[PDB]
Amino acid sequence: QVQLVQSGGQMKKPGESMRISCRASGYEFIDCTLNWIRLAPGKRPEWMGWLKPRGGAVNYCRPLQGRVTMTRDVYSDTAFLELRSLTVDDTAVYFCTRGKNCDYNWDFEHWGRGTPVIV
Amino acid sequence: VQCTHGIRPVVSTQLLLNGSLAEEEVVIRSDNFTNNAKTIIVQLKESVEINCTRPNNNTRKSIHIGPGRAFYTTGEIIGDIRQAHCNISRAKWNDTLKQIVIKLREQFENKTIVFNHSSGGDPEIVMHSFNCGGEFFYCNSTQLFNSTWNNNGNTITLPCRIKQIINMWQEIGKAMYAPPIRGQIRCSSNITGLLLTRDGCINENGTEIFRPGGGDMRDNWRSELYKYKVVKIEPLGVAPTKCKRRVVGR
Amino acid sequence: GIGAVFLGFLGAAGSTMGAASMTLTVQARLLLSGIVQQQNNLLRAPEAQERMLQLTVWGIKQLQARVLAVERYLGDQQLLGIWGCSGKLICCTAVPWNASWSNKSLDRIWNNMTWMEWEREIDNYTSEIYTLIEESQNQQEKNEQELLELD
Amino acid sequence: GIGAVFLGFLGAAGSTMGAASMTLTVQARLLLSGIVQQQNNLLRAPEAQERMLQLTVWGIKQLQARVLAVERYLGDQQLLGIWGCSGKLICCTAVPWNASWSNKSLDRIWNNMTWMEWEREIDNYTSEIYTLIEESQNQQEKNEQELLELD
Amino acid sequence: SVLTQSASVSGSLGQSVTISCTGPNSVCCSHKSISWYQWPPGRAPTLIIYEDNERAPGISPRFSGYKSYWSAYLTISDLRPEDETTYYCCSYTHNSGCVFGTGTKVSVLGQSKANPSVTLFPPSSEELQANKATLVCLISDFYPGAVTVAWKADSSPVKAGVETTTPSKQSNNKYAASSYLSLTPEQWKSHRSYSCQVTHEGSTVEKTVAPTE
Amino acid sequence: VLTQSPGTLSLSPGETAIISCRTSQYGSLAWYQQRPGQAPRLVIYSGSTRAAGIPDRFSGSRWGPDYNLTISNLESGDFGVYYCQQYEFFGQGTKVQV
Amino acid sequence: VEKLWVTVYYGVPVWKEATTTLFCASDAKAYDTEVHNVWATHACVPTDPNPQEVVLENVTEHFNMWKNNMVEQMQEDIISLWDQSLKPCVKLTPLCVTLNCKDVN
Amino acid sequence: QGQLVQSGAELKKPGASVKISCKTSGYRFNFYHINWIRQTAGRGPEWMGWISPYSGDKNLAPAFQDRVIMTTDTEVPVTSFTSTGAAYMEIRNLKFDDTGTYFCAKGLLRDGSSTWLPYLWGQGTLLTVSSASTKGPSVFPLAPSSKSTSGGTAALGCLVKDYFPEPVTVSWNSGALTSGVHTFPAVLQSSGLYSLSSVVTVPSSSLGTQTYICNVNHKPSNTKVDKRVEPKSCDKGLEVLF
Numbered sequence A: 001q002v003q004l005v006q007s008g009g010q011m012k013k014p015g016e017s018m019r020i021s022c023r024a025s026g027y028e029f030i031d032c033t034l035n036w037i038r039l040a041p042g043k044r045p046e047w048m049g050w051l052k053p054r055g056g057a058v059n060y061c062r063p064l065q066g067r068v069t070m071t072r073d074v075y076s077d078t079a080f081l082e083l084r085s086l087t088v089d090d091t092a093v094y095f096c097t098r099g100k101n102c103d104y105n106w107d108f109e110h111w112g113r114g115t116p117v118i119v
Numbered sequence B: 001v002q003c004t005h006g007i008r009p010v011v012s013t014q015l016l017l018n019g020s021l022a023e024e025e026v027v028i029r030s031d032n033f034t035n036n037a038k039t040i041i042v043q044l045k046e047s048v049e050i051n052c053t054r055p056n057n058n059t060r061k062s063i064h065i066g067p068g069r070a071f072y073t074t075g076e077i078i079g080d081i082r083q084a085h086c087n088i089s090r091a092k093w094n095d096t097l098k099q100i101v102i103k104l105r106e107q108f109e110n111k112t113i114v115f116n117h118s119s120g121g122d123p124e125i126v127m128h129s130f131n132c133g134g135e136f137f138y139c140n141s142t143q144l145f146n147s148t149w150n151n152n153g154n155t156i157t158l159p160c161r162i163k164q165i166i167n168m169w170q171e172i173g174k175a176m177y178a179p180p181i182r183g184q185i186r187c188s189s190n191i192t193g194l195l196l197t198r199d200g201c202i203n204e205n206g207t208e209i210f211r212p213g214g215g216d217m218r219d220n221w222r223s224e225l226y227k228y229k230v231v232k233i234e235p236l237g238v239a240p241t242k243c244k245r246r247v248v249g250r
Numbered sequence C, D: 001g002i003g004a005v006f007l008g009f010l011g012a013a014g015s016t017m018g019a020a021s022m023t024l025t026v027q028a029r030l031l032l033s034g035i036v037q038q039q040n041n042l043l044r045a046p047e048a049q050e051r052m053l054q055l056t057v058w059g060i061k062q063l064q065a066r067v068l069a070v071e072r073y074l075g076d077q078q079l080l081g082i083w084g085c086s087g088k089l090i091c092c093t094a095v096p097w098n099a100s101w102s103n104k105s106l107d108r109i110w111n112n113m114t115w116m117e118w119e120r121e122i123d124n125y126t127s128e129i130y131t132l133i134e135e136s137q138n139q140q141e142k143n144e145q146e147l148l149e150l151d
Numbered sequence E: 001s002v003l004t005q006s007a008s009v010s011g012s013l014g015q016s017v018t019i020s021c022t023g024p025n026s027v028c029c030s031h032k033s034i035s036w037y038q039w040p041p042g043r044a045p046t047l048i049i050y051e052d053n054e055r056a057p058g059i060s061p062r063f064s065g066y067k068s069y070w071s072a073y074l075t076i077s078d079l080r081p082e083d084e085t086t087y088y089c090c091s092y093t094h095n096s097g098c099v100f101g102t103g104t105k106v107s108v109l110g111q112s113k114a115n116p117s118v119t120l121f122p123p124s125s126e127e128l129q130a131n132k133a134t135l136v137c138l139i140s141d142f143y144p145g146a147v148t149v150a151w152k153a154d155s156s157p158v159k160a161g162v163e164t165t166t167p168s169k170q171s172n173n174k175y176a177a178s179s180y181l182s183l184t185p186e187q188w189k190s191h192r193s194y195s196c197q198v199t200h201e202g203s204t205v206e207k208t209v210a211p212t213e
Numbered sequence F: 001v002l003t004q005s006p007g008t009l010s011l012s013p014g015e016t017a018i019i020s021c022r023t024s025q026y027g028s029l030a031w032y033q034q035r036p037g038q039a040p041r042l043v044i045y046s047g048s049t050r051a052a053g054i055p056d057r058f059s060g061s062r063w064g065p066d067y068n069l070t071i072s073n074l075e076s077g078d079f080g081v082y083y084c085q086q087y088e089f090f091g092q093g094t095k096v097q098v
Numbered sequence G: 001v002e003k004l005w006v007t008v009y010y011g012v013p014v015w016k017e018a019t020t021t022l023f024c025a026s027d028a029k030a031y032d033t034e035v036h037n038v039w040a041t042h043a044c045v046p047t048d049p050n051p052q053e054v055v056l057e058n059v060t061e062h063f064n065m066w067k068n069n070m071v072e073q074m075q076e077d078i079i080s081l082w083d084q085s086l087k088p089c090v091k092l093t094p095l096c097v098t099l100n101c102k103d104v105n
Numbered sequence H: 001q002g003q004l005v006q007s008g009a010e011l012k013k014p015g016a017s018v019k020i021s022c023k024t025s026g027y028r029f030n031f032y033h034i035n036w037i038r039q040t041a042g043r044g045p046e047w048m049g050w051i052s053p054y055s056g057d058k059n060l061a062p063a064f065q066d067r068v069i070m071t072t073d074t075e076v077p078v079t080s081f082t083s084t085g086a087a088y089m090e091i092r093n094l095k096f097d098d099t100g101t102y103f104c105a106k107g108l109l110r111d112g113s114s115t116w117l118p119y120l121w122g123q124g125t126l127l128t129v130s131s132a133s134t135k136g137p138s139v140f141p142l143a144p145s146s147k148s149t150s151g152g153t154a155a156l157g158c159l160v161k162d163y164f165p166e167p168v169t170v171s172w173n174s175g176a177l178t179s180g181v182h183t184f185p186a187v188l189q190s191s192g193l194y195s196l197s198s199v200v201t202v203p204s205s206s207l208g209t210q211t212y213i214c215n216v217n218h219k220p221s222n223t224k225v226d227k228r229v230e231p232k233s234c235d236k237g238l239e240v241l242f
Ligand SMILES: *[C@@H]1O[C@H](CO)[C@@H](O[C@@H]2O[C@H](CO)[C@@H](O[C@@H]3O[C@H](CO[C@H]4O[C@H](CO[C@H]5O[C@H](CO)[C@@H](O)[C@H](O)[C@@H]5O)[C@@H](O)[C@H](O[C@H]5O[C@H](CO)[C@@H](O)[C@H](O)[C@@H]5O)[C@@H]4O)[C@@H](O)[C@H](O[C@H]4O[C@H](CO)[C@@H](O)[C@H](O)[C@@H]4O[C@H]4O[C@H](CO)[C@@H](O)[C@H](O)[C@@H]4O[C@H]4O[C@H](CO)[C@@H](O)[C@H](O)[C@@H]4O)[C@@H]3O)[C@H](O)[C@H]2NC(C)=O)[C@H](O)[C@H]1NC(C)=O
Pocket: B010, B017, B018, B130, B131, B132, B133, B134, B181, B182, B183, B184, B186, B187, B188, B189, B190, G035, G036
């Protein structure tokens, strides 16, 4: 059993900054790696990047590089996602997930919860 | 063997210091290279010496919180106030980067390669951290990792910050205060390899980016303990040969 | 020559089953005392702090592993006992060779396969084999007894 | 049939001394390795926290008892050695049967009493008996020596 | 060759037959090992027995072997029709040095033979524009391998340009053979309808074919 | 890079469907399925292997450039959109409706 | 062959992939000079002067650095030593006082 | 449990060099010897010599001791129990009778009496040695002719003429045709050329449903010419079926 939950509806105008939450339980937070997905309606599920929660080591995709900012806080088991310079391109809902095991991250067995975002 | 070779348990965050060098030509090691969430370990053939220092001549000051114990700190600074750093030949370093790219192009396509500063994380990861004479450094390694290597003088001085309150292994509200070391300190490490992390979103220009990894610590040991493996001996074994248990008579 | 000269621990790992049949003492020794000779000898170095501050982190790593090595060793010596042959190294039985274990012939077993290789091909049956030797002893142990009564 | 089939640990507890004389291996095995086979096998379950947080409360309960089991076992193997017979299970001596130990006859000893029952009736003399076998070896050990000198 | 091994031997079906090896003391047979192979003509060799007594791996007990001080022997038993091949033996020691045998056309007998099936293919239109005219006679499904070719042109004896073959063993442990006839388009065209003769079991077979057809 | 074919994907509860996916380089295959309110649900973690709560119907089956996911005996929960995932990449995906 | 029989052998050259509690060797020039406290180095045995190794002929073992427990053992150890060595050392818990900091030049 | 492959037919001339190697699979190359045997029609299958890929010890035949020299490459492991490797045998100062079907052969045991004696055998790549030129197998079709009018078959195959040297091979529909395969070898004319043919078995009822073509080739000439049998014809046994 490994629960996951995030924030909710937060409307913003293009060219601004935002921030969301992603609390989790059921495992050694720092041991297993996390990641996000910019799943667009109609379009292909776009990957954003991953994060190692122990040291904070990260990896970002080019279209989201500079804009995206993945963070965390083990004192609260909560992985943050900050995103500046907003557009219509990135209006869709986001989802934070982890792999089936620490051994392999790309087998997403555990996903997040609905997070409405409006632009 | 009965025991391994001498494994110096140094703990760094970006470059691999005082380890063992490659034997023939430099080598690159990863679990899977498509697994962009997997650390690329490099092992140098030629070690590149890196000199470092905290130039300040410090004075110890024992403030006794007691009863039978005191908290030591820098009373003052005898002389000029200066910045900690690390010196390395940029010729040696980038001619070493030549060693790497050609063996990097072996695992990848002959497509041109680029190096970059760390995307993010704690000062531990985003900066070359290490102990030098008892004090913990955090060198800003943008300089060593900012280059594009294709086909068709002076030296480097990396700025460093000293931290005293530190948390190795990222423990549960458990931190360690290293007391200041008296006077100035100057130490010299051999870069023997390092850790890279690929950016898994291949681009037209791109082409393939590699920034200093070092989130987990298990690789520091893999970098040396790769040579070895453990087995359990099982000396008992049964096999047929024409011979009965000599009981044709009793 | 070859059997009367030096070889080394685990040297015949990739040598034929027949070849290895000379270099048993090599890997029949040091199963225990491979470390108790070295430990006692190297530990009496002029330190005088053997087990200082009572026991430590290396304290249990050794004892948890010291106490293993012997029972692990005494497990194989218990088999030699319970099979009635602690002459070690080599010992025949009345238990015949069920070809269901390996249909193959003698010639190639000792001169082409190696023990690492062989014990694999026979791994699954070893349990059934080992249990046959125990029941081979007890038949003999009762047959001994019966004759102790009448003479 | 009966001696070549299954029985079980301590099965002949209430069986005659003669009956039990077949099922020794059953209770001659597992004296040690009864637990080291099971421990090593069951402990390598996918836990990866064998001896985590160093040693604990179950830490000593086992090792204090692990280290017992072997010396306890090696005590009986030391007797087999010091009586000159580590063939185990069954072994004759020159020490004759002092009827002061038990005046009773052969017929009923092996076919009516059980070992639990018997070892009780003979418990008090065992000390004197055991010491007789040791002095039986040493007579033989000197008699061996004397002949090593002259041939 | 050096070692003398019986060149000819035969045996009926369901029975046994023996092949022997002999030579000077140097090449046979005391203090020397002896081997036996089932070397098929047209295919890769197979191994039979070697200790000398111990069989080869994956070989039936039917094959036995013996060695006297002067000669070696091989006893295949309860025969099969797939055994019609040739057999060589060898002489060797531990340090070295295979001295191969002269071989043996063994002959498995007592089997139900069969009549052949012929297909005469004439040259096509494009081939004749090369220019060259070639008549190719085929033979299949027949054993033992024995055929006597007799081309005929204008129903006269053809002595010039005789292309014939030896019967090669087919994959079903039976035999197969082919035949040709080099000829110029000048004679080929205008030659009163061709023919092609072949025979087995003393019963001749033929298929006459036309030029302009 | 992934080529998830084909696109239309509309059938009855009493039928069978097979979704293909193409790639240049090798990798670790997987599959998902979206729902009203719900997010993508994993159904395959190696290729041959199934996820939790997955019957024998979900047949993964081809060692070659073309890999497919078959879910015979369709149902009402099967409506939604699927995607094929290989490492960081994703498939075009396909929506099946009422 | 003949009436073949099982015969048992003790001392065969056979092993299996395994994991178990290792132990550490120290250095001679390291232990002798005090260096006061240093990790948990003092509690180790000394390494043998003769760096003894035996080469294995005709073997080709499989190695995979990534799944190697010696490193899951190494860091396990490395952390344990630190914690225990700092167990007795001075606690700075009351120094959580409000620090009135001016900067330096 | 393994298999061996070799070097293809390398045509050379009397008074030249020719190299013939052997590469392994499914077994430890170092663990076993590598023997060499040809198939001289005049002499017989003469054994040339063996060599140890581990100890580098040899034992050549005094016939070619000075002539030939053997050598081996390193071993490339696949698993902990299997591997791959290479071995060689070059021969200079050639004559005419140095010919036949050449076999490489792995030993039988790692130890014992019959250590070096071969168990597993190679392909058998034929070798001729003459100063004459080389001619390509011009492929052409044949006018169809039935084998049996009772059963109902429509036999068809391709024809090769005037080729040199052996071997030549045929596969139908690029390895996409299984049953009904029948081939045979060639013979040397008075002129000095080899020539062969092929044949297949299919019914005369269904003609234009399946399509077959002969993928003919030749290693020394370097060509892979293809052909197809023209169905439009008139014979004796095939017109009764139509
Ligand atoms: C990769 O590998 C490289 C290579 O190994 C690593 O680089 C190495 O790093 C280590 C540590 O990080 C260095 O070792 C320390 O060196 C310092 C300084 O060196 C002293 O000695 C030099 C000459 O060597 C002499 O001594 C050695 C033995 O140390 C002896 O073998 C030799 O024959 C010779 O006799 C001097 O040149 C040096 O500088 C002096 O001169 C300068 C002008 O020339 C002047 O500016 C300096 O101020 C100084 O006067 C210096 O004297 C050592 O201090 C240190 O030893 C400390 O630690 C041990 C263990 O605890 C202790 O026994 C020592 O006594 C000493 O600790 C006390 O003394 C310190 C002052 O000496 C003081 O600062 C400490 O706080 C401590 O004080 C305590 O004890 C005193 C009583 O002793 C008490 O009164 C106090 O109250 C207090 O309680 C180590 O030896 C290597 O030098 C360095 N190597 C190289 C080539 O750079 C690299 O780090 C690795 N990479 C990574 C990532 O790990």
